[PDB]
């Protein structure tokens, strides 16, 4: 039966993690587990992701491969990232590796590039030319990218050691220090380089830089990521007290201010969408405090958040003609953008580790527990969320410590 009861104290001070789709009555849950990565990793053309990148018929290495019909294809930070996490919690050794030589040849900037914020950040988007060859489109960084590269690199480090290809630890270090040095404001996490004052909530895990402060050798820098994890928990505990009731009704958005203020309409040339919007950066934002909860113990501020957005989204549905909360919102308002797709689906199976509903568990945990993965033009966004809560709610999804 669904724990309803989160304890306040996490996973990796415990040592236990929770097996969500065990708690819900599931079987051949690891089994389920496997055929996603495999489906998402194997060359099958159907589920599959994960891509050999050749110049001149020479193996170089893997990407994720961000498939887009509309505008095309091209290849992401946080796609390949998160392929790289996939793989480090399943002990997938020779996936992660090909990842991550594609990421530090092709994605990383020069140290001396003449745009100093641009050096050692990861450019956010890449194609192949027409003939073939990988080159940056935005050279620009989208920072949760560089988040999970430091993230999956201490795993990496931890469950393998350092001999082998890569010394994962050094590169992980060296990831820490361009976020530090690069992608932050006044410790909380940046949209961009080149805005001040801006995040996104979907950004922030704070246990995930409490791990990083476990994970560095030197007092300041211990204390340096403590300290951006207890200001991110401020951030978005702000940000779920400002979406609270009208006018925001209890979503949280694609943009906030450092005080957790939802930026209202455009605010910079190049945005995808109104800042306000719940879309799709938005939806991960109670993924992650779900995830934060797991690791680090449920406070009052995570259950609260959970609660109340999957409560607008069980609500909205009841007030929709084809019976589906939609992908995107604007104060409590549908955009018409289409029911909910298995991403979406995902992120809100993952929140459930912060919620105490029974009621909503059942209803959003079948609903993502009852899909196929993801397939067709759209499976980039939602067949890697599906694929990391998968890990969610498996009990896979684990953070391992380096030793010193
Ligand atoms: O110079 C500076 C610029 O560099 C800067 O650029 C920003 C860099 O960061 C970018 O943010 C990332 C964008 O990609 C997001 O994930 C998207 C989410 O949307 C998915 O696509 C949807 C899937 O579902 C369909 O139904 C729907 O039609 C799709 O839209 C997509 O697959 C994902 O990749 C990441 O979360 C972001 O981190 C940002 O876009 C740039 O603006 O801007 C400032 C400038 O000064
Ligand atoms: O566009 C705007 C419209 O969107 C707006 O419509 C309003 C939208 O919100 C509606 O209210 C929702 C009601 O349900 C809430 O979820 C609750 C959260 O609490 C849960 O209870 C918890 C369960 O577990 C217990 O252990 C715990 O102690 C409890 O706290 C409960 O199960 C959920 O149902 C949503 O968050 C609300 O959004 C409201 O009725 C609409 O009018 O109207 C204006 C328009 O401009």
């Not at 996603?36 to 020479?58: A, R, S």
């Not at 399943?90 to 990383?108: G, M, P, S, V």
């Not at 060859?133 to 480090?157: C, I, Q, R």
């Not at 909503?360 to 196929?372: G, M, P, T, V, Y």
Request: hydrophobic fraction near 35%; aromatic fraction near 16%; proline fraction near 4%.
């Amino acid at each position: 039966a669904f724990n309803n009861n989160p304890s306040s104290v996490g996973a990796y001070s415990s040592g236990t993690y929770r097996n969500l789709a065990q708690e819900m009555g599931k079987t051949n849950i690891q089994q389920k587990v496997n055929s996603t990565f495999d489906n998402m990793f194997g060359y099958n053309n159907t589920q599959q992701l994960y891509y050999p990148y050749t110049e001149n018929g020479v193996y170089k290495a893997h990407y994720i491969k961000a498939i887009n019909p509309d505008e095309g294809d091209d290849i992401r930070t946080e796609g390949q990232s998160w392929g790289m996490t996939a793989a480090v919690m399943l002990n997938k050794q020779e996936e992660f590796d090909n990842l991550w030589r594609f990421a530090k040849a092709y994605q990383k900037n020069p140290d001396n590039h003449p745009d100093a914020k641009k050096q050692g950040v990861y450019a956010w988007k890449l194609k192949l030319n027409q003939n073939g060859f990988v080159y940056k489109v935005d050279e620009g960084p989208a920072p949760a990218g560089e988040e999970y590269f430091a993230f999956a690199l201490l795993n990496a480090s931890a469950r393998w050691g350092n001999s082998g290809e890569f010394n994962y630890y050094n590169d992980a270090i060296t990831m820490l220090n361009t976020i530090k040095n690069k992608l932050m404001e006044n410790q909380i996490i940046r949209f961009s380089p080149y805005i001040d004052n801006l995040t996104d909530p979907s950004y922030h895990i704070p246990a995930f830089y409490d791990y990083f402060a476990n994970n560095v050798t030197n007092q300041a820098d211990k204390n340096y990521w403590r300290q951006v994890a207890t200001k991110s928990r401020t951030l978005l505990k702000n940000h779920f007290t400002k979406v609270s009731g009208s006018p925001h009704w209890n979503l949280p958005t694609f943009l906030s201010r450092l005080d957790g203020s939802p930026v209202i309409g455009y605010i910079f040339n190049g945005q995808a969408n109104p800042g306000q919007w719940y879309e799709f950066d938005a939806w991960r934002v109670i993924m992650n405090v779900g995830l934060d909860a797991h690791l680090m113990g449920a406070q009052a501020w995570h259950k609260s958040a959970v609660n109340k957005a999957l409560g607008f989204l069980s609500y909205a549905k009841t007030n929709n003609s084809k019976n589906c909360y939609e992908q995107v919102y604007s104060y409590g308002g549908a955009q018409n953008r289409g029911c909910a797709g298995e991403g979406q689906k995902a992120a809100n199976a993952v929140a459930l580790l912060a919620s105490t509903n029974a009621g909503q568990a059942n209803e959003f945990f079948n609903e993502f527990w009852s899909l196929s993965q993801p397939t067709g033009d759209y499976r980039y966004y939602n067949g890697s969320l599906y694929m990391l809560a998968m890990l969610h709610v498996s009990g896979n999804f684990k953070f391992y410590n380096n030793t010193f």
